[PDB]
Design an enzyme around this catalytic site. Structure first.
Site, PDB file in Angstrom:
ATOM      1  CG  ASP A  27      -1.707   1.180   1.273  1.00 41.67           C
ATOM      2  OD1 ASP A  27      -2.057   1.957   0.362  1.00 41.67           O
ATOM      3  OD2 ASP A  27      -2.469   1.381   2.423  1.00 41.67           O
ATOM      4  CB  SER A  51      -2.319  14.344 -13.262  1.00 41.42           C
ATOM      5  OG  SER A  51      -2.689  14.099 -14.725  1.00 41.42           O
TER       6      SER A  51
END
Ligand code: NA
EC number: 3.4.23.22
Length: 330
Positions: A35, A199
């Site tokens: 994770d 992004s």
């Protein structure tokens, strides 16, 4: 040193991936959920409340000649999905794919929430976010990656998750055979303890690319892609009959649909998520309503590039002095 381990989807939907991890002496192999959105290595154990264990493999520290209680240490964690676990702490030898760390904090669960009990395939979590998020008290502990780093050939790990198929976690090297083209690296903020990046925009299907900054985290422990409501609405508007369902808890779509792809930007590069990756199947067994793999992050307080996005790429988690992320097509 290096390590290399195969990661395997737990079910036909790729809801999560499990990776075998050796703990203790002699080795006890547990299948952990790696994770990159958390920083605790915790396991089902001989200490876990018996009614909260249903099929998981447990770690038994009393059977490990290298286990030692980390006296006074406790831990307690709550995840974004509402799940939780807590317990005490041992140090022990932990190996992943041939890479060994001695003295790793292994957090033994005394209590786990129902979603953990109900998932017999996951024996615990191995956190790969920054060690500043580790929950051990009163002495915070390091992640497996942070303890391995100085020994690694390169201070990196990579995630290469499969679509309905196994993939690979590598530590200490880039496998230049595992991706196509070049790797585009992008800046990381560690201020929230995550692999947080920005992004450069998105496209829906064959549509034009929208240049827009989207801050979010690279999180292998989250199944879906969570993005701002504007982006998510623009995606599902291209699927006839898709709608946001308050009763189901997100966007659903007709199981008869063919889904468009979704592209996200990494600097000037582009990662394309095929439409098929966005199908999470019937909402309940036999339903013709299917659950979407792109959902709104509104109310979560962060955008999350979970497995839906990451499995479309070869992802480099660069733990150099200034961390960065890299993405390549594959
Ligand atoms: Na669900």
């Amino acid at each position: 040193s290096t390590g290399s381990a195969t990661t395997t989807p737990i079910d036909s939907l790729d809801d999560a991936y499990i990776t075998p991890v050796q703990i203790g002496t002699p080795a006890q192999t547990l299948n952990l959920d790696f994770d990159t959105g958390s920083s605790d290595l915790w396991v089902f154990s001989s200490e876990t409340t018996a009614s909260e264990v249903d099929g998981q493999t447990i770690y038994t520290p009393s059977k490990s000649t290298t286990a030692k209680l980390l006296s006074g240490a406790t831990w307690s964690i709550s995840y974004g999905d509402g799940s939780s676990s807590s317990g005490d702490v041992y140090t022990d030898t932990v190996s992943v794919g041939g890479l060994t760390v001695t003295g790793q904090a292994v957090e033994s669960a005394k209590k786990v929430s129902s979603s953990f009990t109900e998932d017999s395939t996951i024996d615990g979590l191995l956190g790969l976010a920054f060690s500043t998020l580790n929950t051990v008290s009163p002495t915070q502990q390091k992640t497996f990656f942070d303890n391995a780093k100085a020994s690694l050939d390169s201070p990196v790990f990579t995630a290469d998750l499969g679509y309905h198929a196994p993939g690979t976690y590598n530590f200490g090297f880039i496998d230049t055979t595992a991706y196509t083209g070049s790797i585009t690296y992008t800046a990381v903020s560690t201020k929230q303890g995550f692999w947080e990046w920005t992004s450069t925009g998105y496209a829906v299907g064959s549509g034009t690319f929208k240049s827009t900054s989207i801050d979010g985290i690279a999180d292998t422990g989250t199944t879906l892609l969570y993005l701002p409501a504007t982006v998510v609405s623009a995606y599902w508007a291209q699927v006839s009959g898709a709608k946001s369902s308050s009763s189901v808890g997100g966007y659903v779509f007709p199981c008869s649909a063919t889904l468009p792809s979704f592209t996200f930007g990494v600097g000037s590069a582009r990662i394309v998520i095929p439409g098929d990756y966005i199908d999470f199947g019937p909402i309940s067994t036999g339903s013709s309503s299917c659950f979407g793999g792109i959902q709104s992050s509104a109310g979560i307080g962060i955008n999350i590039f979970g497995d839906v996005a990451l499995k479309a790429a070869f992802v480099v988690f660069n733990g150099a002095t200034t961390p960065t992320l890299g993405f390549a097509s594959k």
